[PDB]
């Protein structure tokens, strides 16, 4: 399937996203420097080509936004069947210590989840799947500035800002959580756990349906949140009480 | 001076470096693609050290947001006068044709500019200057996600995302426009001019104060309409009408 293939695509064998730095035309190697901003972009970069090969393999068409801040990262569809579209959003995170609990941001809960055509590539209803390709890496210190160039012969002498990279493929609704993320609170926070659970799929929600519901009724205001539910628990109650 | 050494160090270093890829510990080199997404992170990488070397040169302390969604990129200050700070943000854009109008985005008008202490590294009232380092690269064909791997002996074969890079250093207010940004839309867009006009500081605001007033009183419109002002003329008019 399109899924399995793509999964094998990022796993085991040969993938090793062991980047060192930026290479110049003269051949000078610039190190990455300490910063998430850089690292996630590189991951997105490694992704593109993988995604475009498993898709084409299965006759799909990959489509990337053009407009700013529009969901999702990659769109995949067969012209003949506009309603069976697929969505893929690349997510990146990092842990301080290797093996700690990771946590992501899954995008907003007040745009295309609430309004079919809001800030998304194609109407929400045309998508059947919403996958998440997550990248996890252990930060290696922060150091500082550079200006130090290296050569091909100093490859192994180059300082990497990260360690043990992991990736996974999962359904958006499966690893999503009940709390809005920090910074925005306009955006869905993921489950908070060990990488393994992502891959295992151990979630909070019962189905993609429960996911959407919780998220559509989530009161955007603190106290108002006290009104309905503040989490999967008070969400269940509210349910039992009459959706009021 | 600071401003001078700075732009001079930008001219010499941000001309020569013609980067073509990302190199790994295996010696593999993945192309870059002309995406503003990857080129801009690259431009910031390059900028870091030169900004530091020059500040240190003049006795300034350099600070970066510990938070990611914060302004500005770099905070410069002289301990001798801790209340006069300088803000430097790095901006990047591309051009499809040499000598053609370009444009940039300059951050949002809704946080610090409006409330002095939101999303900003230090209270807005402490900065005596907000500079903008602008980078313009000359865009080239977007073939395929040719993430084909190349080796060190094939650098000259590696397709570059771009051929050309100009840079300039200017005052924020001086290159600011009266409309919002592309997709972000909640962002201040710059004037829509020619590179030279950037360098020359040929904008539309009469002064820095006219610039804050315009941006502070700007109304959020899902669609223009506005019974206030949508541009410079309208705004100028509005002032003469009592700022109703």
Swiss-Prot record, chains A, B:
Domain of life: Bacteria
Subunit structure: Homodimer.
Record field: transmembrane: none
Impact when changing residue 69 to Q: Decrease in activity
Catalytic reaction list: Endonucleolytic cleavage of DNA to give specific double-stranded fragments with terminal 5'-phosphates
SUPFAM superfamilies: Restriction endonuclease-like
Residues at the active site: 73, 89, 91
Effect of residue 72 to A/G: Loss of activity
Binding site for Mg(2+) 1: 73, 89
Gene name of this polypeptide: ecoRVR
CDD domains named in the record: EcoRV-like
Annotated phenotype, changing residue 184 to D/A/Q: Loss of activity
Protein name according to UniProt: Type II restriction enzyme EcoRV
Keywords: DNA-binding, Endonuclease, Hydrolase, Magnesium, Metal-binding, Nuclease, Plasmid, Restriction system
Requisite cofactors: Mg(2+)
Entry's cofactor comment: Binds 2 magnesium ions per subunit.
Enzyme class per UniProt: hydrolase
Binding locations of Mg(2+) 2: 44, 73
GO BP terms, alphabetized: DNA restriction-modification system
